[PDB]
Amino acid sequence: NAIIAGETSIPSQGENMPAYHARPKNADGPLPIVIVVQEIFGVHEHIRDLCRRLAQEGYLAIAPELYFRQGDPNEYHDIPTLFKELVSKVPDAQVLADLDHVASWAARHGGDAHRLLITGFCWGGRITWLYAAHNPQLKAAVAWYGKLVGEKSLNSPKHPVDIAVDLNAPVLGLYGAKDASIPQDTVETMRQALRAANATAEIVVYPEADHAFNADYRASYHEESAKDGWQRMLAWFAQY
């Protein structure tokens, strides 16, 4: 299925946020939109590949450079410094407002405002849960191995466990059993929160997978889980 891809700016809270976008070539009309939320590495080649893979399925997929005001993840060469000096300085409130601006831009650039979807990975998987409790227009969300519970900070004052109560859209989580950064007890805490909220949501846990099991360029890749998760994501989105 032929696609077309590009880099654009998205007008956002008064500033121009870089973004990559991909979509099917000869589209009939307005497209379902998938906002794609980066890991801490920014809109890496891998994230651009994912947007193109989504476009091959018929989606207008858009990955915004969410860290642009605070800094460039390519200026860091160790994860701890990247976390401390950049990631931990990007406020959740800013991120959710930027995602709203991506949705706004998408509706005037080939997307259908009534068919908004989101998926995100790692750092982006946590943001995915948050966004599902933020935008009442959102139709569905797929969060891949996003942190569920945490200590709070002023930049990041709520975690997915806290907002389960405010979820607006069905959320599918794709999680790895071997992920030491997201222990299974925390998945249980989140399941308790979702049940108490009577939210439409489920978390699928892959027995053999670690964190970042869809990152096909990294050693954490687990092919069987990544391919199953990708099909579960498409199934979750299929009706919208």
Side-chain angles (χ1 to χ4, degrees):
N1 330 281
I3 60 162
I4 52 167
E7 296 171 347
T8 195
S9 290
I10 289 182
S12 192
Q13 312 181 255
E15 287 162 288
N16 298 299
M17 178 167 59
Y20 182 76
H21 61 98
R23 67 187 77 193
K25 193 155 104 91
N26 295 302
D28 252 348
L31 293 163
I33 301 155
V34 180
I35 295 179
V36 176
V37 193
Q38 59 173 81
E39 310 181 284
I40 59 174
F41 311 116
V43 185
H44 185 274
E45 175 60 22
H46 171 58
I47 301 298
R48 303 165 66 110
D49 186 22
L50 298 183
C51 286
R52 291 188 297 267
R53 290 178 52 201
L54 285 165
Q56 294 177 309
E57 304 290 350
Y59 294 104
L60 165 56
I62 301 158
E65 203 63 277
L66 294 162
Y67 297 172
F68 78 107
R69 297 183 190 84
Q70 282 74 38
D72 176 3
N74 296 318
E75 295 194 336
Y76 294 93
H77 308 294
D78 69 276
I79 288 170
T81 303
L82 171 56
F83 257 120
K84 182 175 170 181
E85 305 299 342
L86 179 54
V87 180
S88 291
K89 301 201 184 300
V90 176
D92 292 342
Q94 179 193 271
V95 173
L96 301 181
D98 284 338
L99 297 174
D100 292 336
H101 284 79
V102 169
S104 288
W105 173 92
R108 276 189 292 269
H109 301 266
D112 189 332
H114 296 297
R115 306 182 64 189
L116 188 67
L117 303 166
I118 185 169
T119 193
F121 302 84
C122 193
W123 178 87
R126 171 177 168 279
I127 293 300
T128 291
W129 286 106
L130 300 186
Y131 198 64
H134 171 84
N135 184 349
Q137 279 182 79
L138 181 74
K139 294 296 191 287
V142 179
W144 303 67
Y145 31 86
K147 168 206 321 309
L148 297 170
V149 229
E151 63 156 4
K152 270 85 191 281
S153 70
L154 292 185
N155 281 343
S156 294
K158 310 228 193 134
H159 291 302
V161 285
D162 300 308
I163 52 73
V165 51
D166 294 331
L167 288 167
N168 298 127
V171 184
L172 166 61
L174 298 170
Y175 279 68
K178 313 251 188 156
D179 184 353
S181 78
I182 305 173
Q184 297 307 296
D185 272 338
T186 77
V187 168
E188 176 61 18
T189 303
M190 181 68 169
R191 287 173 168 154
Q192 289 183 356
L194 292 166
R195 290 194 291 267
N198 230 298
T200 296
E202 63 197 50
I203 295 170
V204 171
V205 181
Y206 289 91
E208 299 306 320
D210 202 337
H211 196 77
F213 67 79
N214 195 56
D216 49 76
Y217 74 97
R218 306 218 283 281
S220 60
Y221 184 57
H222 191 258
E223 186 182 23
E224 168 191 63
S225 308
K227 288 197 219 270
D228 185 83
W230 195 253
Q231 292 308 126
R232 286 181 181 270
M233 177 194 67
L234 296 172
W236 192 257
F237 287 159
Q239 78 188 272
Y240 300 106

Tab-separated table of all heavy atoms in Angstrom, residues 2 4 23-32 55 58-60 110-112 115:
chain	number	residue	atom	x	y	z
A	2	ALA	N	0.821	2.037	-1.055
A	2	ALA	CA	1.722	3.190	-1.214
A	2	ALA	C	1.465	4.255	-0.144
A	2	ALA	O	0.325	4.518	0.216
A	2	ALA	CB	1.580	3.776	-2.559
A	4	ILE	N	2.858	8.256	1.668
A	4	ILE	CA	3.602	9.492	1.498
A	4	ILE	C	3.873	10.123	2.858
A	4	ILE	O	2.989	10.179	3.740
A	4	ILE	CB	2.839	10.481	0.658
A	4	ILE	CG1	1.442	10.657	1.233
A	4	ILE	CG2	2.824	10.043	-0.817
A	4	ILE	CD1	0.735	11.819	0.658
A	23	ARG	N	1.079	8.899	5.623
A	23	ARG	CA	-0.322	8.552	5.346
A	23	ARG	C	-0.400	7.753	4.054
A	23	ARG	O	0.555	7.772	3.264
A	23	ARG	CB	-1.141	9.834	5.140
A	23	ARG	CG	-0.729	10.595	3.868
A	23	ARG	CD	-1.455	11.938	3.819
A	23	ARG	NE	-0.838	12.908	4.746
A	23	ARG	CZ	-1.417	14.068	5.088
A	23	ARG	NH1	-2.615	14.393	4.582
A	23	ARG	NH2	-0.802	14.900	5.925
A	24	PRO	N	-1.527	7.059	3.840
A	24	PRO	CA	-1.711	6.410	2.523
A	24	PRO	C	-1.727	7.424	1.379
A	24	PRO	O	-2.283	8.525	1.515
A	24	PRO	CB	-3.087	5.737	2.621
A	24	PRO	CG	-3.699	6.175	3.898
A	24	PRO	CD	-2.665	6.845	4.758
A	25	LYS	N	-1.228	6.999	0.223
A	25	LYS	CA	-1.176	7.852	-0.965
A	25	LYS	C	-2.508	8.388	-1.540
A	25	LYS	O	-2.668	9.603	-1.647
A	25	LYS	CB	-0.361	7.182	-2.068
A	25	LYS	CG	0.001	8.124	-3.204
A	25	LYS	CD	1.250	7.630	-3.912
A	25	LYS	CE	0.924	6.967	-5.241
A	25	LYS	NZ	0.954	7.938	-6.360
A	26	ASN	N	-3.463	7.553	-1.933
A	26	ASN	CA	-4.531	8.187	-2.742
A	26	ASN	C	-5.844	8.344	-2.012
A	26	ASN	O	-6.914	8.115	-2.557
A	26	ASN	CB	-4.640	7.544	-4.119
A	26	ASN	CG	-3.391	7.762	-4.952
A	26	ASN	OD1	-2.989	8.903	-5.215
A	26	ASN	ND2	-2.763	6.664	-5.371
A	27	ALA	N	-5.735	8.782	-0.756
A	27	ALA	CA	-6.833	8.739	0.215
A	27	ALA	C	-8.171	9.245	-0.331
A	27	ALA	O	-8.222	10.227	-1.075
A	27	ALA	CB	-6.448	9.490	1.499
A	28	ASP	N	-9.243	8.562	0.061
A	28	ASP	CA	-10.606	8.856	-0.437
A	28	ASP	C	-11.230	10.105	0.164
A	28	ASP	O	-12.072	10.769	-0.471
A	28	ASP	CB	-11.532	7.691	-0.047
A	28	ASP	CG	-11.920	6.836	-1.219
A	28	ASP	OD1	-11.673	7.272	-2.365
A	28	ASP	OD2	-12.476	5.727	-1.000
A	29	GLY	N	-10.851	10.384	1.405
A	29	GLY	CA	-11.443	11.458	2.193
A	29	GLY	C	-10.637	11.562	3.477
A	29	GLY	O	-9.504	11.090	3.526
A	30	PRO	N	-11.222	12.159	4.529
A	30	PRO	CA	-10.516	12.325	5.801
A	30	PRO	C	-10.131	10.979	6.409
A	30	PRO	O	-10.950	10.028	6.393
A	30	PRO	CB	-11.555	13.022	6.680
A	30	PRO	CG	-12.428	13.769	5.686
A	30	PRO	CD	-12.571	12.759	4.562
A	31	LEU	N	-8.925	10.910	6.973
A	31	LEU	CA	-8.346	9.647	7.451
A	31	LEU	C	-8.480	9.514	8.948
A	31	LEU	O	-8.439	10.525	9.653
A	31	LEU	CB	-6.840	9.606	7.098
A	31	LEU	CG	-6.567	9.525	5.577
A	31	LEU	CD1	-5.098	9.930	5.371
A	31	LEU	CD2	-6.825	8.092	5.152
A	32	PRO	N	-8.585	8.272	9.452
A	32	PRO	CA	-8.396	8.100	10.909
A	32	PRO	C	-6.962	8.530	11.272
A	32	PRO	O	-5.994	8.288	10.473
A	32	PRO	CB	-8.582	6.568	11.118
A	32	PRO	CG	-8.238	5.962	9.742
A	32	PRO	CD	-8.564	6.981	8.689
A	55	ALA	N	0.792	4.059	8.466
A	55	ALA	CA	0.249	4.603	7.206
A	55	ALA	C	-0.052	3.474	6.198
A	55	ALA	O	-1.032	3.548	5.482
A	55	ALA	CB	1.209	5.618	6.599
A	58	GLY	N	-3.490	2.339	6.671
A	58	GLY	CA	-4.557	3.278	6.319
A	58	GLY	C	-4.719	4.492	7.219
A	58	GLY	O	-5.666	5.267	7.014
A	59	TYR	N	-3.775	4.689	8.148
A	59	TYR	CA	-3.840	5.786	9.114
A	59	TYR	C	-2.974	6.992	8.695
A	59	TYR	O	-1.942	6.828	8.009
A	59	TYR	CB	-3.335	5.299	10.494
A	59	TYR	CG	-4.255	4.279	11.068
A	59	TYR	CD1	-3.938	2.918	11.063
A	59	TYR	CD2	-5.502	4.683	11.618
A	59	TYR	CE1	-4.832	1.991	11.566
A	59	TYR	CE2	-6.407	3.738	12.106
A	59	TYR	CZ	-6.050	2.408	12.099
A	59	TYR	OH	-6.946	1.499	12.582
A	60	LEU	N	-3.435	8.181	9.075
A	60	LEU	CA	-2.574	9.398	9.102
A	60	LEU	C	-1.867	9.336	10.449
A	60	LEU	O	-2.478	9.594	11.507
A	60	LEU	CB	-3.414	10.686	8.975
A	60	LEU	CG	-2.704	12.024	9.343
A	60	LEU	CD1	-1.433	12.176	8.502
A	60	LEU	CD2	-3.705	13.201	9.078
A	110	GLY	N	-5.808	16.468	6.609
A	110	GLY	CA	-6.120	15.198	5.999
A	110	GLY	C	-6.737	14.205	6.930
A	110	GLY	O	-7.110	13.096	6.490
A	111	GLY	N	-6.839	14.584	8.207
A	111	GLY	CA	-7.418	13.673	9.196
A	111	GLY	C	-8.862	14.015	9.474
A	111	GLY	O	-9.331	15.127	9.185
A	112	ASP	N	-9.554	13.040	10.044
A	112	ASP	CA	-10.945	13.175	10.496
A	112	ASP	C	-10.952	13.412	12.021
A	112	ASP	O	-10.520	12.556	12.793
A	112	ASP	CB	-11.677	11.856	10.178
A	112	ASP	CG	-13.203	11.921	10.403
A	112	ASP	OD1	-13.674	12.719	11.257
A	112	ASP	OD2	-13.918	11.148	9.707
A	115	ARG	N	-12.166	10.736	14.395
A	115	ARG	CA	-11.493	9.415	14.350
A	115	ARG	C	-10.080	9.557	14.908
A	115	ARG	O	-9.067	9.118	14.322
A	115	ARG	CB	-11.479	8.876	12.899
A	115	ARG	CG	-12.887	8.845	12.290
A	115	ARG	CD	-12.861	8.265	10.856
A	115	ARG	NE	-12.423	6.843	10.875
A	115	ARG	CZ	-12.139	6.148	9.769
A	115	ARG	NH1	-12.227	6.728	8.568
A	115	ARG	NH2	-11.762	4.853	9.861
